[PDB]
C-alpha cells in the first residue's frame, strides 16, 4: 500500500 | 622533486568549486607545513579568519583541522592563534560543524598557558555565552569545564556567573545544553561551590517547564551526588531525586530507571535502602511500559549492589514480590528484558530459595510466547546448576530444555544447540547417550542450515567431552549413513562433520572410518557434493600419514582435477597446491 | 430549575476529573459521553446567548482531559524509514476526547463569550501545554489543536508574542536537535493565516521568523511531509513584502538537494510557485544564479527532475520574464538545452527539450541564432585542439 | 594468469559480506566481467537441479543474509533469484553489488534474473538511484549497474519442468521459443512481451485482465493451465507481489509466488520464504522472519 508500483 | 602541487592547493582554497575547495581545506595541514609556521600564523589563519564559508562538509572539515594546528601554528606560545576562526565555526547554524568547532576548542584549550587562557580563551567563552543567537550560547556551555580549573579566583567567579546565566536562558534549547553540561561543570568547581552554586541550578533545571530539560537534570544528579559527602545528600540532592522519580513526564521517570544503579552507587549503600528500594518498586510498577521494562533491566545489578548485610532479606521481602508480577506482564519488551537478567539472582538467594521462588519463573519464561523472552532466558542456564542441584536441573528444567530444542523460531533451537555441550558434560555421558543423543542427531538434519551448522560443530565439542572412542560408537556411524540421503544439502552435511571430527579423532579413526566415505562420495552426481569432497580432503589432509596421502588421496584427488564442473575443478587443484602434491 | 450558573459548574466537574482509562476495555458505563454532548447542544443550538458567568471550570476541565505527557512513539527509529509511510496510531478514548475538544471549541468561539472570561484563565502556561499536544493521533487530535490554537491566537492579542515564539522553539528543535516531530505540518498552516495578515510595514521579528526559521526548515529530510504547507508560508510571505524575494531565493538555492531527487523536485516546484509571483525588479537579482541552476536541472539524468525543470517553459509569466531579459538568460540555458541530447535512454526529454528551444526562438529570433553561432563556434575549438 | 583474478573476487565478496560496498573503480570492473558472462546466457536460461529459488530481495541486505543462514551458503549450495534486487531497502548497492559479485565468481552456482525494478525508470523513482548518489557521490555506479541489468536473462527453466520469471505470463507470449526470440538486451519497455514477463500477475478474475499496476496483464487460472500444458511445464514459479505468508499457491497448484523480502520496505510485516528444489524436483518451502537487526 506504499505506492501500486509494490504494501 | 617539486613544490608545485602544494602551492596549487593554496590556490584551490578559493576555487569556487566546493568539491575542490574541500580537498584543499581537508589537507589544510600539509599547506601550513610547506607553508611554514611563522607564515601559517600571519597568512593562513588570517585567511581562514576573514573568509565565510558556506557548504557544510567544508566547514566541518576546517573545524576538525583547526584542532591539530597546536603544532603547525608554532606550539603553545601561539595556540591562542587558532581561536578566531574556531570561535566563528562555533557560531555556525548547522550543529555538527559547531559541535566539532567545540570539540576543537576543548582540545586546543589544554594547550593554552593559564596566562593566555585568562586573556584569550576565556574571553571567547564569554563572547559565545553572551551571543545574540542561541547556537553560540548553546556551544559556550561545552567550554566551561576546560578553563575553570586553571583561571584565577577572580575569573573562576566570573565564569560561574556566566554559566548560571546559560542555565537560566529563555530558550529551552540553551537550557537543555547547560543541563547536560551541569554535571561535568560541577566536577571541577571547588567543593563549597558545588553545594552553594551547582546545587541551585541543579534543582531549577530539574523543575523546568520543559520536561526535555528536567530529564537531563536527573543525569547530572548522579554526578553531583558523587561530589557531595553522604550527610549533605539528604539535604541538597534527595529532595530533587525523589521528585524526579515521581515526575509527571514518564520521560523524566524513565531516566531514574536507566540511571538507577548509577544513582545507587553515588548516593550510598544506605540511603539506597532508605529511599531507592521503595522508589525502585514504584518504577517496576510504573504506568509506562518503558519505565517498567527499564527498571527490569536494572534488577540483577541493583541487588548484587545492595548492602552486604540485608541483600538476601530485601531481595526477598521487597524486590521479589514485584518481580513475580513483571514475569506476568503484558508488554513483551518488559517480560523480554527482565527475563534476560532475572537469573543473576540465583547466586544471591541460594540453592534453596532459588528453587522455591525463582526457579518457577524460569519455567514461566522458558515457555512464554515471545521468542525474545524464551531466547533471553535460555541463555543463562550454563549457570543455575551452580546453585540448584545438577539433579534439580535435569529434573525440573531439563524437560523444557528438551522441548525447546525444537520449537519454531530457529534462533531459539540454536540457543539450545549451543548450551548443549555443557548440559552434556554436567549431566554425564551415560545420561546423554540414553535420552539426549537422539536430539543432537536430529539437528544434524534441520530444514534451516543455521541449525545444521551449529549441530555439526556441536559434535566436535562433544568428542572433546567424551573421548574419540565414544564417537566411533555413537556418532561416526550415523554421520555416515547420512551420505545416503537423496538431498545433497543433507548429503553434504556428512563431509562437513567429517571436516570437524578429524580435528579431534586421532590419525586412526579418521583414516579407517571417515576417509573411506570422503572418497566414495567423490563420485556423486551433484557437483556441489563433489567440489566439497575436494575441499574436505584438504581439511582432513594433514591428519593423514604421508603414505596414505600419496596413495588413496592424490590418485582420487586427480580424477577431479579433470572434472566437468568448473568448481570441482578449481577446488581439486587448490586441494593439491596446499597439500603439496604438485 | 432556572439557576444554571450552578447546574453546569457541577455538571462540568462531573465530566472533568472523570478520567476513564480506555486501555483495559472494562467499566463500559458511558455517563460522560453524554454530559459533554449536552454542554454542546446547550451552548450551540441557540439554547443560550447568556452563559458568560465568571467561571473557568471549562478550562480546568479541558486542561485535564488533554494535558498529559504524550506516550512513547510507536514508529521506528528514522534513518531507513520515511514518515510518509508511518502507520497512524489512533488514540483510544477518542470518542471521549473528541468532544472535550469539540466543546472547548464551540466554547470561546461563540459570541457574547468575552475574552476576559479567559484573559487570566488561559495564560501562557495553558498555551504551552496545548502546544506539545500537537503530536500524534492522526490529524484527528492534531486537526483540533490546529484550530483551537488558531482561534486562541486570533483573540488574545496578549498571547501572540508567546504563541509565536514558543512555536519557533518547537521548530528550532525540529531542525537542529531531533529531526523528529509530527505536527510541523499542522503548525505551518496556523502560521499560514498568521503571516497573511502581518503589519503592512513588516515588523523585524518576522523577517527573522522567515530567514532564520522558515527557510532552514527545507534543510530537513522528512520535508516531503510539510513542504506544501511550507511553500505557502514562503510564498505568502513574499506577497506581504517582495523585498525578501532575493534572500529567500538565495536560500532555496544554497540548500538545494544533492542526493535526494524527490526533494530536488519539490524545490523546483516551490521555486516556480515563487517565480510565479516574483516581481520584475526582483527577478533580476535572482535570475542569473536561479536559471544557472535550472540549467543543470534540465541537464539532469533523473527524468523526474529534468521533466519538472523544463515545465518552467509553459509558464506564461516565467516566459514573459525570460524574454524581457533574454540577453543574459538565453546563453546560460543554451549549452544545456541545445546540449548534445543524442546520448539518452528516456526517449522523452530529447523531445521535451526541442519544444523548449522552439519556445525560445519565438521570443528573440536574432539572439537565439547568435547564441547558436557562439555555441557551435566554441564547441568547434574544443573538438579540434582537444584531440592531440 | 587464472589466480590473478579469482583470488580477488573471493575478497570483494568477503568485503561485501561485512556489508562494505566496493569502490566506484571496482563496480565498473565487476560489472564488465559480469557482462561478458551474462551475454552468453539465453533469455530462457536453462539451469539444472537441485537449486534454491529465491524471490524479491529489495536491498534488504541483512534479510538477504538471513536467507543464506537458511538455504545454506554459495557456492556450497546452488541458487536462483528472480529479480527485484534493488529499491525500497536501505542497502541496495551492497546487495546487488554482492549478488552480481557471486555470479562473476561461482558462475554456475547462482542464477540471477531481471525484475520489474532492474530498469532505469524505476530505480530512479523508487530509490536505487538516490542511494547510489548518497553513497558514491557521482551517478556512475548507477549507470554501470543499470547497464549490467539489460544483459540479465528474462526467465529460467529448472530441468525443463519448472518455469521461473519475476512477473507472469504474457499474451504476446505462447511458447518458450516466443521468448527465446525476444531481444532482452534493452531497457524494460512500457508495453510489450518482455515488459509483461516482468510485470504480469496471477489473477482470479480469469482470462487476460487489465493489471491495476500499469503494465503487464492479469492472466488467470485458464491462461496458466494452458501455458503449462503447452511447453510441458509442471509448475510456473515467479514472485513479484508481497505474499504475506512468504509464498502462495494459486491457480490450482499451477503457479506459485515467492517473496523473499521480509517485513518488506521495513513496513509491510510479512514472513518471507524461499523454495528448495532437491535432486528430484521436490517442493519444500522454507519461511523465515526478518533477521534480528
Ligand atoms: Mn517486483
Ligand atoms: Mn517487488
UniProtKB/Swiss-Prot annotation, chain B:
GO biological process, one term: RNA polymerase II transcription initiation surveillance
Sequence segments annotated as region (PP2A subunit C binding): 393-582
N6-acetyllysine sites (modified residues): 273
Region spans: PP2A subunit B binding: 1-392
Record region (SV40 small T antigen binding): 78-232
Example of a GO MF term: protein antigen binding
Stretches the record annotates as Polyoma small and medium T antigens Binding: 40-314
Cellular localization per UniProt: Cytoplasm; Nucleus; Chromosome; Chromosome, Centromere
GO annotation, cellular component aspect: chromatin; chromosome, centromeric region; cytoplasm; cytosol; dendrite; extracellular exosome; FAR/SIN/STRIPAK complex; glutamatergic synapse
Record note on domains: Each HEAT repeat appears to consist of two alpha helices joined by a hydrophilic region, the intrarepeat loop. The repeat units may be arranged laterally to form a rod-like structure.
Function: The PR65 subunit of protein phosphatase 2A serves as a scaffolding molecule to coordinate the assembly of the catalytic subunit and a variable regulatory B subunit. Upon interaction with GNA12 promotes dephosphorylation of microtubule associated protein TAU/MAPT. Required for proper chromosome segregation and for centromeric localization of SGO1 in mitosis. Together with RACK1 adapter, mediates dephosphorylation of AKT1 at 'Ser-473', preventing AKT1 activation and AKT-mTOR signaling pathway. Dephosphorylation of AKT1 is essential for regulatory T-cells (Treg) homeostasis and stability.
Annotated family: Belongs to the phosphatase 2A regulatory subunit A family.
Protein name per Swiss-Prot or TrEMBL: Serine/threonine-protein phosphatase 2A 65 kDa regulatory subunit A alpha isoform
Curated annotation (Swiss-Prot), chain C:
GO biological process, one term: DNA damage response, signal transduction by p53 class mediator
Gene Ontology CC terms: chromosome, centromeric region; cytosol; Golgi apparatus; nucleoplasm; nucleus; protein phosphatase type 2A complex
Modification after translation, per record: Isoform Gamma-3 is phosphorylated on serine residues. Isoform Gamma-1 phosphorylation by ERK2 is IER3-dependent and inhibits ERK dephosphorylation by PP2A-PPP2R5C.
The organism's place on the tree of life at top rank: Eukaryota
Motif window: Nuclear localization signal: 379-385
Tissues in which the protein is found: Highest levels in heart, skeletal muscle and brain. Lower levels in pancreas, kidney, lung and placenta. Very low levels in liver.
Induction note: Up-regulated upon DNA damage.
Main location: nucleus
Location in or out of the cell: Nucleus; Chromosome, Centromere
GO MF term list: protein phosphatase activator activity; protein phosphatase regulator activity
Keywords noted in UniProt: Acetylation, Centromere, Chromosome, Nucleus, Phosphoprotein
Function: The B regulatory subunit might modulate substrate selectivity and catalytic activity, and might also direct the localization of the catalytic enzyme to a particular subcellular compartment. The PP2A-PPP2R5C holoenzyme may specifically dephosphorylate and activate TP53 and play a role in DNA damage-induced inhibition of cell proliferation. PP2A-PPP2R5C may also regulate the ERK signaling pathway through ERK dephosphorylation.
Family named by the database record: Belongs to the phosphatase 2A regulatory subunit B56 family.
Full protein name: Serine/threonine-protein phosphatase 2A 56 kDa regulatory subunit gamma isoform
Swiss-Prot record, chain D:
Main subcellular localisation: cytoplasm
GO cellular component, one term: mitochondrion
Cofactor stoichiometry and binding remark: Binds 2 metal ions per subunit. Can be two manganese ions, or one iron ion and one zinc ion.
Gene Ontology molecular function: GABA receptor binding; metal ion binding; phosphoprotein phosphatase activity; protein heterodimerization activity; protein serine/threonine phosphatase activity; protein tyrosine phosphatase activity; RNA polymerase II CTD heptapeptide repeat S2 phosphatase activity; RNA polymerase II CTD heptapeptide repeat S5 phosphatase activity
Effect of residue 222 to H: In HJS3; decreased phosphatase activity in an in vitro assay; no effect on C-terminal methylation; no effect on the interaction with PP2A subunit A PPP2R1A/PPP2R1B; no effect on interaction with PP2A subunit B components
Outcome of mutating residue 222 to V: In HJS3; no effect on phosphatase activity in an in vitro assay; no effect on the interaction with PP2A subunit A PPP2R1A/PPP2R1B; no effect on interaction with PP2A subunit B components
Effect upon mutating residue 126 to C: In HJS3; almost complete loss of phosphatase activity in an in vitro assay; strong decrease in C-terminal methylation; no effect on the interaction with PP2A subunit A PPP2R1A/PPP2R1B; decreased interaction with PP2A subunit B components PPP2R5A, PPP2R5B, PPP2R5C, PPP2R5D, PPP2R5E and PPP2R3A; no effect on interaction with PP2A subunit B component PPP2R2A
Positions with a binding annotation for Mn(2+) 1: 56, 58, 84
Record's subcellular location: Cytoplasm; Nucleus; Chromosome; Chromosome, Centromere
Residues the record marks as active site: 117
GO biological process: intracellular signal transduction; meiotic cell cycle; mesoderm development; mitotic cell cycle; negative regulation of canonical Wnt signaling pathway; negative regulation of epithelial to mesenchymal transition; negative regulation of glycolytic process through fructose-6-phosphate; negative regulation of hippo signaling
Domain of life: Eukaryota
Binding site residues for Fe(3+): 84, 116, 166, 240
Protein residues bound to Mn(2+) 2: 84, 116, 166, 240
Binding site for Zn(2+): 56, 58, 84
Keyword Cytoplasm in annotation: yes
Entry EC number(s): 3.1.3.16
Amino acid at each position: 500500500x506504499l505506492x501500486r508500483x509494490x504494501x | 622533486d617539486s613544490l608545485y602541487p602544494i602551492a596549487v592547493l593554496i590556490d584551490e582554497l578559493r576555487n569556487e568549486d566546493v568539491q575542490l575547495r574541500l580537498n584543499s581545506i581537508k589537507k589544510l595541514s600539509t599547506i601550513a607545513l610547506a607553508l611554514g609556521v611563522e607564515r601559517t600564523r600571519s597568512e593562513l589563519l588570517p585567511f581562514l579568519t576573514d573568509t565565510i564559508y558556506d557548504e557544510d562538509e567544508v566547514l566541518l572539515a576546517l573545524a576538525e583541522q583547526l584542532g591539530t594546528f597546536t603544532t603547525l601554528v608554532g606550539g603553545p606560545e601561539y595556540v591562542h592563534c587558532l581561536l578566531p576562526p574556531l570561535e566563528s565555526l562555533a557560531t555556525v547554524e548547522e550543529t555538527v560543524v559547531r559541535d566539532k568547532a567545540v570539540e576543537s576548542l576543548r582540545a586546543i584549550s589544554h594547550e593554552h598557558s593559564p596566562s593566555d587562557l585568562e586573556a584569550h580563551f576565556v574571553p571567547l567563552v564569554k563572547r559565545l555565552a553572551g551571543g545574540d543567537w542561541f547556537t553560540s550560547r548553546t556551544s559556550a556551555c561545552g567550554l566551561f569545564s576546560v578553563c575553570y580549573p586553571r583561571v584565577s579566583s577572580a575569573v573562576k567567579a566570573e565564569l560561574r556567573q556566566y554559566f548560571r546565566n546559560l542555565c537560566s536562558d529563555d530558550t529551552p534549547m540553551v537550557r537543555r545544553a547547560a543541563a547536560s553540561k551541569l554535571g561535568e561543570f560541577a566536577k571541577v568547581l571547588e567543593l563549597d561551590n558545588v553545594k552553594s552554586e551547582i546545587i541551585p541550578m541543579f534543582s531549577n533545571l530539574a523543575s523546568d517547564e520543559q520536561d526535555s530539560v528536567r530529564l537531563l537534570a536527573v543525569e547530572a544528579c548522579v554526578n553531583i551526588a558523587q561530589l557531595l559527602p553522604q550527610e549533605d545528600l539528604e539535604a541538597l540532592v534527595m529532595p530533587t531525586l525523589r521528585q524526579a522519580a515521581e515526575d509527571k513526564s514518564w520521560r523524566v521517570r524513565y531516566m531514574v530507571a536507566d540511571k538507577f544503579t548509577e544513582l545507587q552507587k553515588a548516593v550510598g549503600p544506605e540511603i539506597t535502602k532508605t529511599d531507592l528500594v521503595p522508589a525502585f518498586q514504584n518504577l517496576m510498577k510504573d504506568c509506562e511500559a518503558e519505565v517498567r521494562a527499564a527498571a527490569s533491566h536494572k534488577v540483577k545489578e541493583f541487588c548484587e549492589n545492595l548492602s552486604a548485610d540485608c541483600r538476601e532479606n530485601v531481595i526477598m521481602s521487597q524486590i521479589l514480590p514485584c518481580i513475580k508480577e513483571l514475569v506476568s506482564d503484558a508488554n513483551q519488551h518488559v517480560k523480554s528484558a527482565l527475563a534476560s537478567v532475572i537469573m543473576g539472582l540465583s547466586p544471591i538467594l541460594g540453592k534453596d530459595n532459588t528453587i522455591e521462588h525463582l526457579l518457577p519463573l524460569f519455567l514461566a519464561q522458558l515457555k512464554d510466547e515471545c521468542p525474545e523472552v524464551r531466547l533471553n532466558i535460555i541463555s543463562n542456564l550454563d549457570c543455575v546448576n551452580e546453585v540448584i542441584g545438577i539433579r534439580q536441573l535435569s529434573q525440573s528444567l531439563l524437560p523444557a530444555i528438551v522441548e525447546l530444542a525444537e520449537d519454531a523460531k530457529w534462533r531459539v533451537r540454536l540457543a539450545i544447540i549451543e548450551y548443549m555441550p555443557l548440559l552434556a558434560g554436567q549431566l554425564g555421558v551415560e545420561f546423554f547417550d540414553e535420552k539426549l543423543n537422539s536430539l543432537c542427531m536430529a539437528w544434524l538434519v534441520d530444514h534451516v542450515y543455521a541449525i545444521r551448522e551449529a549441530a555439526t560443530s556441536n559434535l566436535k565439542k562433544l568428542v572433546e567431552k567424551f573421548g574419540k572412542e565414544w564417537a566411533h560408537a555413537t556418532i561416526i556411524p550415523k554421520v555416515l549413513a547420512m551420505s545416503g540421503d537423496p538431498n545433497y544439502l543433507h548429503r553434504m552435511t556428512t563431509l562437513f562433520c567429517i571436516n570437524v571430527l578429524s580435528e579431534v579423532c586421532g590419525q586412526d579413526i579418521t583414516t579407517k572410518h571417515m576417509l573411506p566415505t570422503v572418497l566414495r562420495m567423490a563420485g556423486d552426481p551433484v557437483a556441489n557434493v563433489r567440489f566439497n569432497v575436494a575441499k574436505s580432503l584438504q581439511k582432513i589432509g594433514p591428519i593423514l600419514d604421508n603414505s596414505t596421502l600419496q596413495s588413496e588421496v592424490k590418485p582420487i584427488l586427480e580424477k577431479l582435477t579433470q572434472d566437468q564442473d568448473v568448481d570441482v575443478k578449481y577446488f581439486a587443484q587448490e586441494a593439491l597446491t596446499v597439500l603439496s602434491l604438485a | 430549575q432556572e439557576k444554571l450558573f450552578i447546574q453546569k459548574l457541577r455538571q462540568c466537574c462531573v465530566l472533568f476529573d472523570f478520567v476513564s482509562d480506555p486501555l483495559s476495555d472494562l467499566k463500559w458505563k458511558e455517563v460522560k459521553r453524554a454530559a459533554l454532548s449536552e454542554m454542546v447542544e446547550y451552548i450551540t443550538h441557540n439554547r443560550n446567548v447568556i452563559t458568560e458567568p465568571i467561571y473557568p471550570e471549562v478550562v480546568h476541565m479541558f486542561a485535564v482531559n488533554m494535558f498529559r505527557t504524550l506516550p512513547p512513539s510507536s514508529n521506528p527509529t528514522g534513518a531507513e524509514f520515511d514518515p510518509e509511510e508511518d502507520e497512524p496510531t489512533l488514540e483510544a478514548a477518542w470518542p471521549h476526547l473528541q468532544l472535550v475538544y469539540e466543546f472547548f471549541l464551540r466554547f470561546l468561539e461563540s459570541p457574547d463569550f468575552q475574552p476576559n472570561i479567559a484573559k487570566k484563565y488561559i495564560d501562557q502556561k495553558f498555551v504551552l501545554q496545548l502546544l506539545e499536544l500537537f503530536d500524534s493521533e492522526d490529524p484527528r487530535e492534531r486537526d483540533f489543536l490546529k484550530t483551537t490554537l488558531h482561534r486562541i491566537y486570533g483573540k488574545f492579542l496578549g498571547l501572540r508574542a508567546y504563541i509565536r515564539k514558543q512555536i519557533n522553539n518547537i521548530f528550532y528543535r525540529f531542525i537542529y536537535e531531533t529531526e523528529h516531530h509530527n505536527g510541523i505540518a499542522e503548525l505551518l498552516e496556523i502560521l499560514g493565516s498568521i503571516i497573511n495578515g502581518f503589519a503592512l510595514p513588516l515588523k523585524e521579528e518576522h523577517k527573522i521568523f522567515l530567514l532564520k526559521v522558515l527557510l532552514p526548515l527545507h534543510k530537513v529530510k522528512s520535508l516531503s511531509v510539510y513542504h506544501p504547507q511550507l511553500a505557502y508560508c514562503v510564498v505568502q510571505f513574499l506577497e506581504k513584502d517582495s523585498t525578501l524575494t532575493e534572500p529567500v531565493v538565495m536560500a532555496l538555492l544554497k540548500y538545494w538537494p544533492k542526493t535526494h531527487s524527490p526533494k530536488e523536485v519539490m524545490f523546483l516546484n516551490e521555486l516556480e510557485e515563487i517565480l510565479d509571483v516574483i516581481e520584475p525588479s526582483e527577478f533580476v537579482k535572482i535570475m542569473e544564479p536561479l536559471f544557472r541552476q535550472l540549467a543543470k536541472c534540465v541537464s539532469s539524468p533523473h527524468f523526474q527532475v529534468a521533466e519538472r525543470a523544463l515545465y518552467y517553459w509553459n509558464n506564461e509569466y516565467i516566459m514573459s520574464l525570460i524574454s524581457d531579459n533574454a540577453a543574459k538568460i538565453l546563453p546560460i540555458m543554451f549549452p544545456s538545452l541545445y546540449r548534445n541530447s543524442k546520448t539518452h535512454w528516456n526517449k522523452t526529454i530529447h523531445g521535451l527539450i526541442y519544444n523548449a528551444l522552439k519556445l525560445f526562438m519565438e521570443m528573440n529570433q536574432k539572439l537565439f541564432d547568435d547564441c547558436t553561432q557562439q555555441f557551435k563556434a566554441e564547441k568547434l575549438k574544443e573538438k579540434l585542439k582537444m584531440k592531440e | 594468469d587464472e589466480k590473478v583474478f579469482t583470488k580477488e573476487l573471493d575478497q570483494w565478496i568477503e568485503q561485501l559480506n561485512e556489508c562494505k560496498q566496493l569502490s566506484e573503480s571496482q563496480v565498473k570492473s565487476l560489472c564488465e566481467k559480469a557482462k561478458e558472462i551474462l551475454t552468453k546466457e539465453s533469455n530462457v536460461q536453462e539451469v539444472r537441479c537441485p537449486v534454491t529459488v529465491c524471490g524479491d530481495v529489495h536491498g534488504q541486505f541483512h534479510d538477504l543474509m538471513e536467507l543464506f543462514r537458511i538455504g545454506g551458503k554459495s557456492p556450497d549450495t546452488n541458487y536462483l533469484f528472480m529479480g527485484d534486487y534493488v529499491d525500497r531497502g536501505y542497502y541496495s548497492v551492497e546487495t546487488v553489488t554482492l549478488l552480481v559479485a557471486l555470479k562473476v565468481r561461482y558462475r554456475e552456482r547462482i542464477t540471477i534474473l531481471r525484475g520489474n525494478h532492474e530498469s532505469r525508470q524505476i530505480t530512479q523513482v523508487y530509490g536505487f538511484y538516490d542511494e547510489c548518489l548518497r553513497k558514491y557521490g557521482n551517478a556512475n555506479v548507477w549507470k554501470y549497474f543499470t547497464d549490467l541489468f539489460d544483459y540479465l536473462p528474462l526467465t529460467a527453466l529448472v530441468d525443463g519442468q519448472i518455469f521461473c520469471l519475476h512477473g507472469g505470463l504474457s499474451p504476446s507470449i505462447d511458447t518458450l521459443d516466443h521468448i527465446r526470440a525476444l531481444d532482452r538486451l534493452q531497457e524494460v519497455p512500457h508495453e510489450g512481451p518482455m515488459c509483461d514477463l516482468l510485470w504480469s500477475d496471477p489473477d482470479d478474475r480469469g482470462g487476460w485482465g487489465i493489471s491495476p499496476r500499469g503494465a503487464g496483464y492479469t492472466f488467470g487460472q485458464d491462461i496458466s493451465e494452458t501455458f503449462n500444458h503447452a511447453n510441458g511445464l509442471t509448475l510456473v514459479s515467479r514472485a513479484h507481489q508481497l505474499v504475506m505468508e512468504g509464498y502462495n499457491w494459486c491457480h490450482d497448484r499451477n503457479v506459485v509466488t515467492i517473496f523473499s523480502a521480509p517485513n518488506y520496505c521495513y513496513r509491510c510485516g510479512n514472513q518471507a520464504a524461499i523454495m528448495e528444489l532437491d535432486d528430484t524436483l521436490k517442493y519444500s518451502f522454507l519461511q523465515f522472519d526478518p533477521a534480528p537487526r
